[PDB]
Amino acid sequence: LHKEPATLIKAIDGDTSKLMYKGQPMTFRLLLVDTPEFNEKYGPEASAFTKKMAENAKKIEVEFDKGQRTDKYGRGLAYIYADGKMVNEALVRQGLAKVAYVYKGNNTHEQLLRKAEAQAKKEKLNIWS
Numbered sequence: 001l002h003k004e005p006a007t008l009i010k011a012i013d014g015d016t017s018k019l020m021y022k023g024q025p026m027t028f029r030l031l032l033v034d035t036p037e038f039n040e041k042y043g044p045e046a047s048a049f050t051k052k053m054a055e056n057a058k059k060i061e062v063e064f065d066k067g068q069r070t071d072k073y074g075r076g077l078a079y080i081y082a083d084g085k086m087v088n089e090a091l092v093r094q095g096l097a098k099v100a101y102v103y104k105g106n107n108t109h110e111q112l113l114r115k116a117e118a119q120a121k122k123e124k125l126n127i128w129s
């Protein structure tokens with residue numbers, strides 16, 4: 001997999017953000033994770049965490065997996081990095097997302113994220129509390 005450039009346009013919620021990619025606006029949905037909706041418990045915390053991580057980053061990068069790059073809603077599906085730190089992983093490690101939506105052929109970082117979820121759960125963090 002390869003990291004490609006993007007810039008933040010606007011935060012949206014815990015697991016979606018609006019980025020400019022190849023000079024086009026796109027909503028990106030983070031691969032392999034599920035955050036609570038804003039209206040749900042920890043939903044506000046997950047939105048805040050993703051907004052802060054993206055807005056503070058000097059460098060945002062998109063990394064597509066091997067399989068589908070856009071979902072049925074036209075959202076880009078990717079791993080998103082902020083100054084080299086994967087936002088998908090960081091949410092799960094903090095207990096602000098669960099590993100979820102693991103489809104065959106877009107699951108390169110599944111085991112990395114499951115390890116982070118196990119550690120968040122052992123710490124009883126947030127969703128696991």
Ligand SMILES: Cc1cn([C@H]2C[C@H](OP(=O)(O)O)[C@@H](COP(=O)(O)O)O2)c(=O)[nH]c1=O
Nearest residue numbers: 029030031032033034071072077101103106
């Ligand atoms: C994360 C992800 C979601 N989706 C679709 C599945 C779900 O369909 P439904 O909308 O029919 O439930 C929806 C979940 O996204 P959200 O969690 O953003 O709502 O996004 C994919 O198709 N591929 C993916 O990799």
Ligand SMILES: [Ca+2]
Nearest residue numbers: 015034035036
């Ligand atoms: Ca969600």
